[PDB]
Ligand binder design. Structure first.
Ligand SMILES: N#CCc1nccn1CC(F)(F)F
Ligand SMILES: N#CCc1nccn1CC(F)(F)F
Ligand SMILES: [Cl-]
Ligand SMILES: [Cl-]
Ligand SMILES: [Cl-]
Length: 163
C-alpha cells in the first residue's frame, strides 16, 4: 500500500504516467479504438492480446511486467441513463478489485465514459464520483489523467473538498 494513500490529478497523456499500472478506457472488443485507448495501444500494444471483455468489467493484461487494466465503461449512446449509470459504477468496482489483486502502490486512471462514450453529455461529476466510490477502500495512490484545462480545475476542486 501507499504510506498515506492520496488522490491527485494531472493534465497530460496517460501513456506518459509515473504510476505502477494503468487503466485503459477500453472498448469491449480489445480494438485499438481512439482517444485514451489509441494512446494506450501505441504505448503498450502487447497488452491487447485477449483483452476483449464485456461492458462493466475490467481485464488485466501484462506488457512485460507493467499491468494494463482494460476497463470497459458503457457507451451512453446505446444504454439508458439508468442502465449506463449501473455499468459505469460496476466497471470502476472491477478496477478496484484488479488494483488490489496486483498489489501495486499506485495506479493511473482516466474518467471512464466521459469522451466518445458520453452520449454528448458532461459526465465529469458522475464518472469521478463512481471512481471515488470504488477506489476509496483501496490503499493505492490514485492519479487521475485528463486533457481539458477546466476539467483539471474541477477534478482538483472535488479532490480538495474531501480534504
Ligand atoms: N462534455 C464533454 C466532453 C468534454 N469536454 C471537455 C472535456 N471533456 C471530456 C472529454 F474530453 F471528452 F473526454
Ligand atoms: N438508446 C439510447 C441511449 C439513450 N437513451 C436515453 C438517453 N440516452 C443516452 C444519451 F442521452 F445519449 F446520453
Ligand atoms: Cl502530454
Ligand atoms: Cl470515453
Ligand atoms: Cl478531459
Amino acid at each position: 500500500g501507499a504510506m498515506a494513500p492520496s488522490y491527485r490529478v494531472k493534465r497530460m497523456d496517460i501513456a506518459k504516467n509515473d504510476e505502477e499500472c494503468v487503466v485503459n478506457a477500453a472498448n469491449p472488443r480489445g480494438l485499438p479504438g481512439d482517444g485514451v485507448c489509441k494512446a494506450v495501444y501505441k504505448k503498450w500494444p502487447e497488452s491487447f492480446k485477449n483483452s476483449a471483455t464485456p461492458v462493466g468489467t475490467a481485464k488485466t493484461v501484462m506488457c512485460g511486467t507493467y499491468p494494463v487494466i482494460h476497463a470497459v465503461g458503457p457507451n451512453f449512446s446505446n444504454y439508458t441513463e439508468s442502465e449506463g449509470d449501473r455499468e459505469l459504477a460496476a466497471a470502476y468496482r472491477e478496477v478496484a478489485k484488479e488494483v488490489t489483486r496486483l498489489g501495486v502502490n499506485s495506479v493511473a486512471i482516466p474518467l471512464l465514459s466521459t469522451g466518445v462514450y458520453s452520449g454528448g453529455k458532461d459526465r465529469l461529476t458522475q464518472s469521478l464520483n463512481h471512481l471515488f466510490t470504488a477506489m476509496d477502500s483501496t490503499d493505492a495512490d490514485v492519479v487521475i489523467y485528463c486533457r481539458d484545462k477546466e476539467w483539471e480545475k474541477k477534478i482538483s476542486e472535488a479532490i480538495q473538498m474531501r480534504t
